[PDB]
């Protein structure tokens, strides 16, 4: 489960927020521990596809909660538009935190269902700045479902260094890591 | 809170409208879930709704393959607003509606309290092949501010009894089915 | 002069039918000049929402800082500048007013509530099969008189706001309907 | 501000008019010009979902005024109105005259409020010609409320040519560029 | 199951198609006998989402076949692309042939599975001509997944006259009616 | 060569592993590779050839997915047209490759060039490759290339080849199983 390590990338990565700007979670365990670290006073709007991240966007006083809706899906408990991403299209997120099973320079981020391409495809398009949030296991994984390469991300936030492979290959494309 | 083993009963009987394989529409309330967990744990059925409590109980059903309508969250009934199009929605055209109301009224119709609730109410009773009310006694006679429609908008209205000789009367003129 | 003691009678009958409105209530406001005073004399910390069919309504409406506003369009007419609806599905259908305030030019008691202008009574009949309470509010002037547009009986009226109690035959008539005189 | 800007791009989409149509009229302050430079002896049917606009609209002699309903939001004093689907029924606009606060080769046309875009997109289905109305500050900004892609509108009107990359982009899609 | 009335549907349907045209085709047992009636001299390029579509297809001389790939689905064996945003996007068929299993005057046109609803979606923005061959059995019958309003179409053909209140329908929103 | 080619296809399905997602080649050698897959093993699949799809819809566990595009005769594939709407999207656990040739120099070439653009993309996306080929196909050069025999993780056979391949396959860390 790794949580001690995906809770320090996500108190991490929620240091990017700033007040009033317009959020994307990604579906999993890691971005729910993003919701929690933003200060309960800083206001925000938020949009999700995924129930454990919209019941985290629930108990913050001052978000604006969006939800993604669609076909449940119990994997990840995620919601799958049947074709248009008509609540989606409303947005163009200031950031958007991903989620990913693996890291890969040469095949990209991964996940194990398809069902979530829709949506993180949507965000990789729409959101302003991408930020791509995984613990220190995921780097050298490939998983079947492709999100895309890794040039899609403008930072990678993790719990430690990665290995010199990924951050070499992240000064050549000007990718930021936070760890 | 209070008339739960009413809303059990008017929810018992609203269950034995479905048949397998229909596609339901489930409005937002404390009533709706009781129909949830009556039906058939073993029926196979399609379900729509647009509000938490009702979407955690389709989630609770092992044959039910649950879309829930999205968009801006309101407290009130934990209900998702679309901004406009209702895209999920949209894809849609329900064997049966089970329908709330806080207010059952001849003249001025069926109400409920939140104006939000009316774009998805008003989407149901368009597109819906059959519209059920689920209403406790209580409702009768009532008027809350927002307003889903006419009676005779809906095909059958379910309460836990038979309500008073006006309503009986109404809902035979109007050709309405009561069930209690 | 007439005009300013006028203004005085709407405001001190307005500022009685104010008393009325409760917290979080859906209200109407019909049109003209004296349901403006209702608006204004409502305490501003009270939240509530309401629903108008003309331009000085609104307006009033959109100064008090804890009022949810809704304005019924469609095409405007200079005479009370109010919004005729295209279709009453946009936006009046869609309540059923806790308390509609009415605006009448004449009020008698067996030619009713009347206005000037016929193109009103489209949505005052709505307010009046709609909304839950139906509170009239008149200065002293308007009692015996009959213009052409008849809005309905004054027993359809559940109470009658003026600025002074009006004549012992209205008194009479509101005991026999069960109407409740404010004044 | 940029009120010189405003007026002389609106004074252009003006010319698009034509005597006895129907048209619809954007909030924000872009649009009132467009109202003002319509030659005062057109006859013309407009309708609208902002109180500055209605009130600019309602100072022209010879134009049927229409104002769209529903809850009033403070911010370009709008109309929301309470069901999309009951939006000005039976109304076909032979020209919508649109507002944006940035315009996004990738992102499209944003606006700062979700609350405007129901009316904004009850016009992209309903008008016959999609006219945006912008001075040269709005390109390359994104802002969080979106609007559409910038192929929904058949022209962009502006004070000035824009920077190559939209003159290349409305080459490619066929959008005619008005400055 | 009035297969002769499909097959007299689709004949009559056929006759709309013209040499080089690109055309897309819709799953079920209808539109396999407009492929039937298009002569085999008739050059033409044909986009399709199913098996038994397809294999009609492969049988034309001088079709050039085009099919939708994506996740199998038994009924009506079609493909379901895994991102609708993905789907097609260098197509744009002259004529885009649609089935249904209901066609209702309020309600719209209506199918059995929601897994058709896509690519039928990607068809009714992409096509130019949008045309609904269904046999008489279709008017007033209502499904559960919706493909969208009667007014979508730009042709209804049918084997028959269908009744009153579809020819008024057709009239008032300029649905041409062929039979 | 059937004998031979389902003795080889019958040693590839050996190392499909349960909810694997798998890429297979066109050709008469790949569907005789779904067919010794146990009917009782759930897997994924993606493909781009008619004949290898149908073999997919005859497995009763099978998640079939088929790449579209334009429908070419020889060896009956698809020719994608965009690679971002099926293929972008998988990583498969395992590709099963086809070949019309197996060279020491030349590596691994097919008759037709149509089927590169979807074999080069399962040699750079696949998290395994695995070339199934009778032993015919070693020595033989045919005109469209598809890589060096070191881009294949494990070749699979119905007997041993020459001993050429034993060496090259061993300086290569290439494993060869027949
Ligand atoms: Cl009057
Ligand atoms: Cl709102
Ligand atoms: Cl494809
Ligand atoms: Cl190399």
Request: charged fraction near 25%.
């Amino acid at each position: 489960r790794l949580v001690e390590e995906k809770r320090r990338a996500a108190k991490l990565a929620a240091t990017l927020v700033e007040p009033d700007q317009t959020l994307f979670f990604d579906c999993g365990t890691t971005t729910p521990w993003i919701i929690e670290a933003i200060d309960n006073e800083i206001p925000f709007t938020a949009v999700c596809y995924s129930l454990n991240t919209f019941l985290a966007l629930k108990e913050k006083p001052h978000c604006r909660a969006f939800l993604c809706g669609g076909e449940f899906h119990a994997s990840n408990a995620i919601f799958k538009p049947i074709d248009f991403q008509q609540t989606l299209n409303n947005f163009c997120p200031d950031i958007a935190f991903y989620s990913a099973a693996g890291v890969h320079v040469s095949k990209g981020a991964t996940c194990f269902n398809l069902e979530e391409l829709p949506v993180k495809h949507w965000a990789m398009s729409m959101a302003q700045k991408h930020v791509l949030v995984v613990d220190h296991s995921k780097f050298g994984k490939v998983r079947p479902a492709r999100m895309g390469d890794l040039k899609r991300f403008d930072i990678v936030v993790s719990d430690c260094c990665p290995e010199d492979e990924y951050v070499k290959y992240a000064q050549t494309q000007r990718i930021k890591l936070m760890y």
